[PDB]
Amino acid sequence: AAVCDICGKGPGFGKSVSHSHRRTSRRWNPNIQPVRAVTRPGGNKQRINACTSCIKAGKVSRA
Amino acid sequence: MKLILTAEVEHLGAAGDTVEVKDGYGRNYLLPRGLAIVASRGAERQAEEIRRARESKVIRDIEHANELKTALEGLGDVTLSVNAAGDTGKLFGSVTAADVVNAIKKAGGPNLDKRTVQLAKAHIKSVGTHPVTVKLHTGVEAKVSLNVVAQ
RNA sequence: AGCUGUCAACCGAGCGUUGAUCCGAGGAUGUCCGAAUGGGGAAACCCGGCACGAGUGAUGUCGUGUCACCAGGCGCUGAAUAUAUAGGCGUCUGGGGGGAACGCGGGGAAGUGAAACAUCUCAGUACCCGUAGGAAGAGAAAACAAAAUGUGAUUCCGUGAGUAGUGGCGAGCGAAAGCGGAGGAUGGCUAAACCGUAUGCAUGUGAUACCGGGUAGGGGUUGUGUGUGCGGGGUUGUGG
RNA sequence: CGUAGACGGUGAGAGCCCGGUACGUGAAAACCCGACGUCUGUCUUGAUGGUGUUCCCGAGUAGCAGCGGGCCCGUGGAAUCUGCUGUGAAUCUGCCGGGACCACCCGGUAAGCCUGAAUACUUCCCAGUGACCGAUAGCGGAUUAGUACCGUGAGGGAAU
RNA sequence: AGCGAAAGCGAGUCUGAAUAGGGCGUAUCCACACAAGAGUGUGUGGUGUAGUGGUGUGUUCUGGACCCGAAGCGGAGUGAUCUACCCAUGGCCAGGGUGAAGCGCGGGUAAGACCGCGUGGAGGCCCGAACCCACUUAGGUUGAAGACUGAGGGGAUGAGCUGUGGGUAGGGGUGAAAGGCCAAUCAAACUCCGUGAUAGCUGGUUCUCCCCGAAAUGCAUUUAGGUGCAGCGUCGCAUG
RNA sequence: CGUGUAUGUGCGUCCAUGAUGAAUCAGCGGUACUAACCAUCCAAAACCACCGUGACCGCACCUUUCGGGGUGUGGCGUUG
RNA sequence: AAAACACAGGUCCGUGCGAAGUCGCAAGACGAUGUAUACGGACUGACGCCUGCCCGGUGCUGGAAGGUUAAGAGGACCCGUUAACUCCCUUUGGGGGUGAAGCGGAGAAUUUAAGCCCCAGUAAACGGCGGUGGUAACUAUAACCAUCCUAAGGUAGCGA
RNA sequence: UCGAUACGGUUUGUGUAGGAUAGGUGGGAGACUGUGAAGCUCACACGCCAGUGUGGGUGGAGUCGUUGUUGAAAUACCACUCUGAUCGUAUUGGGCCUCUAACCUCGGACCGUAUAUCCGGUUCAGGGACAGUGCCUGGUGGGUAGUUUAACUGGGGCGG
RNA sequence: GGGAGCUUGACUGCGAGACGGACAUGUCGAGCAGGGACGAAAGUCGGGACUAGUGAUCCGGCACCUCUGAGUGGAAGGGG
């Protein structure tokens, strides 16, 4: 789970750098959690994967 | 999260009381269960919140109140106004559960909520005593009927 | 005025001034396979679902259409659960795949060099992925410069300069400002109160009450915009 | 003869034999590029310039950290630009940028956009060029050429 | 126009409290003087200093860099039609033997245990063809054959053999484990690409003649068959 | 495997002939649902007893000269 | 082609069950349509008599109170610039000391993890498994004299 | 359960002589009581070997007047309450028990769905605010990877 | 070489002409302010009788400096 289904946040790519300065490719994954989002106030909770940024920004609705 | 309550909650306030509670609490318990609303605008979260609190307190149903309200809804025919064509009848708009609820209130009397009427099930596309059902309780239907006239 | 393409001859047939063969532009047909797409499949080969010609005493056959899956729009329908929905049905519109280079965005080596080697280099290379277009990305400064009534979007060339720097300060790496040029083209919207409006709540007490004014009245924008859409009367600094 | 002496062909060095060449002319159709009118929108439902006082001037944003990427800049005193994670501001006495902070001073009004030309390339088509190769050369390929042949395959791959 | 690290100063400048000396500069050269013989200085006066663009040539830098040559490394793919193992579904195993368990009958057993007799026809049972193997031997050893042949030899109802269709794929598979097998290659397959890898190493480097003409030493070296500099060669200038 | 024909049996209905209708208005038992009752059931609060000694101290040491440790002489946090 | 591998049998360890283990980034799969009398792993290797001592080193399994111990919003103090205070010259302005609000640095006290240190287990875990020399230790010999060192000293059995 | 921040109800201060616990400096020194200061068995408990703190019943017109200097003159009275045991709120913290709503469940039942051990919606039942991975962080880490493991040397190694 | 007196010539700061010198390290210091004494005048000293007792560069520390300070003022940083 590295892509947000709302904003499309993909994982960034970079290097993990050691004390000896060996740089080894690693991934900054988004913090996306399984959220049972409620599209309409009705109540049917459809499961999706949303980044914590969207959860904090209120683009998810766990109604 | 700054939000004004719509009902009474413990140490969170009362209906209309503003409080800041953390995002998880608001987002998962309050906004879902309808016990509060985020204060986008102070005047809004005040007046809309108060209206919602009163409306819930007035539209609450009960076990025996369920059958009593079924009896009350078994009164007559309600009527709604929406613009149609010259003869086609293709309504310019479309009935809503809110429309049906308010029409029932203003004509018949009985107070109730949007989680009563089966509006789509009662396709209401033209005019006349198109019937609708208010699901008063777990299994208490009510074929309240609803005429349609020009707006 | 010869032609029936060529290897590529041999014929036997023929065509052509009434205009052939030849050239150019439109069309028509365009088997089967291939994104291949009715289903299947070992590609080009196997099996199927309306109306017509048949093929009759009839089944059997072949001709034409059409029939994949996806998204998106629009109509119905609205399971389990009740307004209400995932989904299902029907119809339109697209997508799919290929292509040598160039573009953009991502992923990203190692040989190699460092006379070893890991930092580093190789190199953001090769390769890989996603995607375009005829070009693409960037583009109309909350910029750059420094006290000059300085320039005034971006891009691309030459310089600045192998300089300043950077660097196990090793191997190496290496700008920018400024300047000279190619080109020139400093358009529109989002905010505000609302003009107006359209539409999703709550009913107070259906009067706040509206054309902005005063001055007649009922039951009016019900009245209150918090939520959006829309033509703005709307819209850059020493301010709209 | 020459506004034609480009180049080729023709039985051997052809301006004058031939296709041509200089120079002229030729589109029914189709396509492209232009204008010319319908047509489309807007402005006219108006243009002018000055005063003083509230709201507006793009938010999960800027900013701040923790880890990275990029810049001459290899983490360095490290600005500016950026990804992921948290934390998270005000709207003009605001906010950034001047490689950290100022009586400062200058640049001005980001967090939403579209924008031609100058630019890169040539699968393909057209017309040409060569102090290019001339059959072991030049394309692997002047012939059958990605053919024959080899390999299960990816692929390799001629000779004439 | 240099000196210095710049406020910088400038034919001077840096160092220095110290006109103390030095460093680096004021092209060069000539005359005059003043000086001191510490190797010559100081001023003064004369002529006025020569770069920079092409371009040839030799070296050199970055590139493949004079040419050929590794084992190997990386990226992306191709291979389980050979082989390893496994999965589905089939097939085969001439002939003989031995004779298990059970199941009956008789002795003994208080009765059982047990012992004989019959039936029974079990076994990774025995002998032995097909089949599958590959122990010994001779031959082949520019073979008939890139692993075979002839004689013998092991298994041969099983952990058997085998057909067909499948699956596992490279730092991976499979392995009754030999580092074995993975398409005649396996201590990391193969093809293409990075790529003309890199190699202080080996080899090769093509016409002529005239002049000169070495070195195999020193020092240093992750150095000792390499290299830097010196030494020694040559060609230009200058001194002679 | 399909078409036409003829007959043989062959059997539909408006019909005909047969089986059944099979539930209603009253009115009972069984699920026994409303609440409550029984059989079983595992517990919280208070409650006691113990192993045990997270707290305490010395009391004895093979002895540090007992003078550091640890177990019994013990009331304890029954702290687990 | 064997003495090697395997083998049936053993023992240890792991595993409470989309187990452990393995292929996978993940989903999922196998394990197994199984269930601790089952699986996976390690070693040994029918069967018979047996597998003696040692937990010191290193693994593993538990944890004894401490100490060490990153990542944080624990942020004293200190440092930059300055509204401003003081004084010197000097007076159409620069020289010292003090310096709030701030914003910008470096940041100490204190602060809790795992691991380590540490205590007990574990040898069918990797691995260990001595002397004395005073005796008649019998001068074929197993014990005995009573001796230092560790954690122990090679026990039965076998042995050119 | 224990923390930290804004104020805070009353004593709490033998300095040295001493009504003798001189409350912090001023107001003080008419400000202090009948529903009610005192000495008191005592309510309530705090010591500097000074006695103390507000008082129910007593008690009743109560203390006081540089009461004598011990400068601060009885804490007998005024502001900040100053060393300071206890303050009650709101903000934010280590930890334990939890209420379920996040999130999780390969536990059940339904429906999409004729087909369905997929998955995903509903619901129930369980976990549960843990776990899961996200960022950052410490440890273990030949499981994998890139590498390095000098030269001289009467060959190399050992030795030097 | 052995003794005493004083003292701190590692003149430190500036430095002679010279010389030892594959490229990367040494000897005198004659002069200058400021010293050391002994002394008395003259006088001598840049650690040692002499040759060993040490390690380039890079990177950073620490002190002082009338050096730079990315718009200006400082500052960070750099430089000597």
Dihedral of alpha carbons B2, B7, B12, B14, sign: positive
Q: Report the alpha-carbon distance of residue B1 to residue B29 in Å, rounded.
A: 13
Element (H, E) at B79: strand B77-81
Q: What is the rounded distance in angstroms from the CA atom of residue B24 to the CA atom of residue B40?
A: 18
Please give the C-alpha separations between residue B25 and each of A56, B2, B109, B137, B140, in angstroms, as whole numbers.
12, 11, 38, 30, 35
- Provide, as residue numbers in chain B, all residues whose Cβ is less than 8 Å from the Cβ of A38: 32
Q: Is residue B149 part of a domain?
A: no
| Same domain for B9 and B51 | yes
E strand or H helix that includes residue B116 = none
CA atoms of B92 and B89, how far apart (whole Å)? 9
Q: Are B98 and B129 in contact (CB under 8 A)?
A: no
Of the candidates B108, B117, B123, the residue with the CA atom closest to the CA atom of residue B136? B117
Asked, for residue B45, whether it belongs to a domain, the answer is yes
Q: Are B125 and B70 within one domain?
A: yes
| CB–CB contact B28 A58 (8 Å) | no
Are B80 and B30 in a shared domain? no
Residue type, A58: G
Question: B93 and B121: one domain?
Answer: yes
Comparing CA positions, the residue from B42, B20, B43 lying closest to residue B30 is B20
Residue bearing tokens 């429309």: B99
Nucleotides of C under 7 A from a protein CB: 76-86, 106-109, 118-120, 199-203, 225-227
Whole-angstrom Cα distance, residue A4 to residue A49? 6
**Could you tell me if B84 and B127 are in contact, meaning their C-beta atoms sit under 8 angstroms apart?**
yes
Count of alpha carbons within 13 angstroms of residue B26, beta-carbon side: 21
Is A59 in the B-facing interface, judged by CB distances under 8 Å?
no
Shared domain check, B30 and B91: no
Indicate the length of chain A as a whole number. Answer: 63
Closest C-alpha to B74, from B137, B135, B145: B145
- Centroid of chain to Cα B135: 12
Provide the number of CB pairs (under 8 Å) joining chain A to chain B. Answer: 12
The experimental method is: cryo-EM
Give the whole-angstrom CA distance, residue B122 versus residue B29.
33
- Spatial CB neighbours of B41, under 8 Å, sequence gap ≥ 6: none
Instruction: Tell me, in Å, the resolution of the deposited structure.
Output: 2.8
CB contact under 8 A, B32 and A58: no
Range of the domain at B35: 2-58
CA angle B59, B78, B64 (to 5 degrees): 35
Which of A56, A61, A63 is the closest to B23 by Cβ?
A: A56
State residue B129 phi and psi, 5-degree precision.
-80, 55
